[PDB]
Amino acid sequence: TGQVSVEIEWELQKENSKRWNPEIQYTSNYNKSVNVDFTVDTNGVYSEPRPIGTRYLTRNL
Amino acid sequence: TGQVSVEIEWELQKENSKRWNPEIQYTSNYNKSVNVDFTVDTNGVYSEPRPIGTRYLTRNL
Amino acid sequence: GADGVGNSSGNWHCDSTWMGDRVITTSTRTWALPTYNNHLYKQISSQSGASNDNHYFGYSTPWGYFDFNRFHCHFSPRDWQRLINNNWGFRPKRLNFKLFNIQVKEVTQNDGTTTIANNLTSTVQVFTDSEYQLPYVLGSAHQGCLPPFPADVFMVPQYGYLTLNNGSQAVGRSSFYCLEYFPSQMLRTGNNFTFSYTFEDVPFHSSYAHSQSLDRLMNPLIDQYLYYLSRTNTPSGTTTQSRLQFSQAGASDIRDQSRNWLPGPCYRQQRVSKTSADNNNSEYSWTGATKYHLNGRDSLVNPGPAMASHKDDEEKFFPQSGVLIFGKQGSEKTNVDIEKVMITDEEEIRTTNPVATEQYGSVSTNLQRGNRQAATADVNTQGVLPGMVWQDRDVYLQGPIWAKIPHTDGHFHPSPLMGGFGLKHPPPQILIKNTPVPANPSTTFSAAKFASFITQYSTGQVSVEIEWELQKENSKRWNPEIQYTSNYNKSVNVDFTVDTNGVYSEPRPIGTRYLTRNL
Amino acid sequence: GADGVGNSSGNWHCDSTWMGDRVITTSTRTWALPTYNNHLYKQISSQSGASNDNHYFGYSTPWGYFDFNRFHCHFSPRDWQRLINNNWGFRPKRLNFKLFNIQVKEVTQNDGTTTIANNLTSTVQVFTDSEYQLPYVLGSAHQGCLPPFPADVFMVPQYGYLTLNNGSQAVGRSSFYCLEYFPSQMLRTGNNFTFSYTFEDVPFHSSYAHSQSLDRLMNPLIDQYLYYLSRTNTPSGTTTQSRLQFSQAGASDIRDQSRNWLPGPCYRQQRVSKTSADNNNSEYSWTGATKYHLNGRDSLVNPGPAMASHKDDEEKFFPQSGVLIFGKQGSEKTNVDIEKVMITDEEEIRTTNPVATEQYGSVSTNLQRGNRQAATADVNTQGVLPGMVWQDRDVYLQGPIWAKIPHTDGHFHPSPLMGGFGLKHPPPQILIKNTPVPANPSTTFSAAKFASFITQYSTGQVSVEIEWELQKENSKRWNPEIQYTSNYNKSVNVDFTVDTNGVYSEPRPIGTRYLTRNL
């Protein structure tokens, strides 16, 4: 047994958009709940509630 | 009559947060509707649907 | 800009110069710009009950825009002939744009008379996006071009766009663009505007036609060394039995020879005739159309993929939507007879692209055996396969020069389907508007949007200059070519000329493909 | 770290040196770190039905942490006396931290015996956040300090935190921190860890007591030149009439004199007595408490604002929560008699801060007239007003040295309410954990979380060194001061010493305020 490590460098592309109104963003729901999303439960098992894609910000075709 | 112009320079403070799970973000609703928020209507009067505050990202006390 | 009210801000330049290898064109027109929508934005959408195909949602703006995208703006009928007769291809390189001699007029409609007078201190503001941040309208072949004939005057068309909808209702992702939110340049009398632009590298357009059909590439004198399966059975006694024979393909076998290539792809069309007697009696227009289906609605493919219009010795037939169609002088918008329209012909591409009204070929449907008999079926739609060559659609004289390639993760052979040059960074949209001048506010303060403005419009001259690159021809063809000629017989009116009432007209479509090349 | 298994990674340093102006202390302790929660995170919350005040939501982690925040860690009872007797104030400056001599043990519990043996290749990993990114637990006066007596050994306390809740349920804004998600430093036998830290500038703590009460600032010999309203009416004939007389205030009038200052603010407390006979018979504990109300739940103010405990010649009474309370040796957690607790005394602040069990003063409730008579009422709560001076609460011998000021848009007089030094960037939390060592996986592959680990724990020595800055005294007081003295009579046990069974104990709380200053 032992420990392993990984480090990746990523390149990003920023956005210049003249869209006047607001975008759609990925949000967590603010209502109360028994368990927080993407968190351990009372027994200590980490879980992921839903799939999350990368497509939110909008571009013109 | 004429035209007036204003230009302000702002200073920003970025965030380093070790919070594991996602934040709450300001989102526009993606359901269909007659009018888009923050946009002219069919008669050309611009309107603002709701007040929007600045407090979303979270910090520890 | 520069100088005064009395000084002129620019000279009239309309000319063409031919340098050999590259070549340069220039033109100047006169325009008039109204105020649109009473200085305000409006959302527009489809009207009440409509077909699910016809729904749309979008916005219209006070701003106008300039469109030079058609060839006939740049080239005169004669200048078009040192090009198409003398050359194997051409492409754009760089262009210039200029506005000048701007003057703004205000109008007073009181009673039954309308007085018009200069407003010397009013402005007109112009910008070019050039970062491609706006919806790109040009390339959809709308009206509002610079006129083909240099002495005509034209309005500037109004600008607007469309966005994602559900029915007649907007979706959360739908976008709204305020053109006031860009830096622009405010111009008065005695101020001018310029910018210059450089085309990205693009292939020459092919103005040649082929002298060889793809089905005949080879020497008739010499036989191949390959064998094909020729006879499947032989008579034995009274009745045949199964015996396989093979053969080498000669000049009598030309049908059967091996080849290294295949014809281009097809997406098939319905065929109609110019003679009214051959066509069926019913309404098949929308029902018999070829279509594509995107997000639950259906759209006609009007140009469609590039395919020959007709075969040999049928000139009477053309694809239903498969061709471009131009109107004659003064033709109306709707329900107009065939004698009024001008139908283009795509033929010279017979040698590679298949005919649009017929199947690509035939393919085997089943496995034979002793008691089963071979079966085939027609393939009416073929995608691209390795070893497949084709040609693109011709630009003609009047039609799209370029289009903007959509910004996407993938695309194939971007040359656009109407014709011309696909560009990732095309010439940027030029946008222009009259600055609002309010009229006589009330004495006490009120916070409200002004409904009352001075009524005014502007006019001036615009200029465009493009540099073109040419490709000359070395041909060892012994005999003469086919050239574009005007008929020498006498006639009442000369082609491409004013009539007795002074309306310039264009008799026929003129394509670029005359000179011949070997395949 | 450095070198080998056989080489030692550090020497034992526990000492104190006194340089005059700036003074230095050092200590070293021995610790043992268990594995907590079986190497995994768990959310915790309030249990089923509970008072709306008692709900909470949060997480507990496998990680431990070091707490030196109490004074008695750093100062010995005698070293505490070249400080409080000889000086008018002190503050911290900079500190060091070190870990060394780390060794990890694995245990085998089979049958009725438990064998323990070295695991030489196992690791222990440590980090210090120092960017203040984690919830900051220290400063809440929990258990788990370095022992006061250098020969004792202690466990490291477990780390955890709390977050916004609604009842026992979480809210969308609630945050979850994984400590694995920070860079740390993995240490084996023969590796050591260090860092150093510098306190931000902070005012000296005041170890003086005042020799003048705020109500007497002035010369008894000389009268003022100001007038106060003295008599409101005078006898005329048989009965009085309204006549206003004025007077200058002398030594007989000292009650009535003008002053430039006012006493500090109060938030009032309930009073109880150490003699059990004076106290009412009922349960007033929670009902008679002073509280604050935040988001629909109620919390006791345990220290509350700094106020004197009792007036002159009543030693029997103290505020209900208003004082700190320490337990004697071996006292239990719940429902323990007064003889077991040690109650601190706040008195020397009588001269400025008002007594906690009484009102701030009296204020006029109404406007008088001929037929109305003047009315007043007690003010039991007073906020800060211009011209108001006070003192802070004393640190004593054992108690909070510092606290972290919350990060907020505003705060007033940040000195913390238990005592000590408010810091915006306090000494960072040190966190430590045992690295999990898996045990004997199955032969075939399975994707599941390991429930099975080697059972092991670690131990070593830790060291802390702080530099302190001192403020000496120039006093022209002729007569002697009050000093902290041990009683010289014979006794069974010496104070601050082991007993016959070897348990070190602290007899009484010792504050820092002895030497006297003029107000």
Side-chain angles (χ1 to χ4, degrees), chain C residues 340-517:
Chain C
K340 303 298 183 181
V341 297
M342 296 185 287
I343 293 170
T344 61
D345 184 2
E346 292 299 320
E347 62 185 343
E348 300 83 357
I349 308 302
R350 291 177 183 172
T351 60
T352 57
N353 287 129
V355 174
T357 59
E358 293 176 348
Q359 73 287 0
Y360 181 81
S362 62
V363 175
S364 179
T365 303
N366 65 346
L367 296 173
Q368 69 175 20
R369 72 173 66 197
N371 63 35
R372 301 290 182 270
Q373 187 172 354
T376 59
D378 288 344
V379 56
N380 292 285
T381 298
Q382 186 66 63
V384 175
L385 274 64
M388 183 178 283
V389 297
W390 62 92
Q391 291 291 100
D392 287 342
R393 186 178 293 274
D394 185 357
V395 296
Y396 299 89
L397 174 61
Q398 64 283 359
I401 294 171
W402 62 85
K404 179 174 177 288
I405 298 167
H407 187 64
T408 55
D409 286 345
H411 55 282
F412 180 78
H413 196 276
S415 177
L417 274 66
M418 296 177 185
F421 301 99
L423 295 173
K424 291 182 179 297
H425 302 291
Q429 293 174 332
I430 294 101
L431 278 68
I432 185 168
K433 186 180 69 67
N434 287 334
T435 299
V437 177
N440 192 30
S442 65
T443 299
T444 187
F445 175 80
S446 177
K449 183 176 76 179
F450 287 88
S452 64
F453 296 98
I454 302 300
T455 302
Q456 63 181 19
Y457 68 93
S458 63
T459 188
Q461 291 86 2
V462 66
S463 178
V464 178
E465 183 177 2
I466 296 172
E467 181 179 1
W468 295 92
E469 186 178 4
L470 299 174
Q471 188 174 356
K472 300 299 183 181
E473 77 287 6
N474 287 338
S475 64
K476 300 299 284 188
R477 175 177 179 168
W478 180 258
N479 59 344
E481 288 295 326
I482 292 171
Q483 299 297 317
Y484 173 76
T485 302
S486 64
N487 189 340
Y488 63 90
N489 290 337
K490 64 181 178 181
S491 64
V492 175
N493 297 133
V494 175
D495 290 345
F496 298 93
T497 302
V498 298
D499 65 7
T500 188
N501 296 131
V503 294
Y504 174 77
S505 65
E506 296 176 350
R508 61 183 64 85
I510 298 170
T512 191
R513 289 176 178 168
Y514 289 92
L515 293 173
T516 300
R517 185 189 292 274

Side-chain angles (χ1 to χ4, degrees), chain A residues 1-3 28-36 38-46, chain D residues 40-43 57 59 123 166 169-174 176 186 435-438 449:
Chain A
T1 188
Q3 291 86 2
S28 64
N29 189 340
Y30 63 90
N31 290 337
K32 64 181 178 181
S33 64
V34 175
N35 297 133
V36 175
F38 298 93
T39 302
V40 298
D41 65 7
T42 188
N43 296 131
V45 294
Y46 173 77
Chain D
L40 59 81
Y41 290 81
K42 293 176 179 178
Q43 72 172 21
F57 180 85
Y59 298 90
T123 61
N166 188 340
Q169 292 180 336
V171 175
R173 298 185 182 280
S174 62
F176 169 78
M186 297 178 74
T435 299
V437 177
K449 183 176 76 179

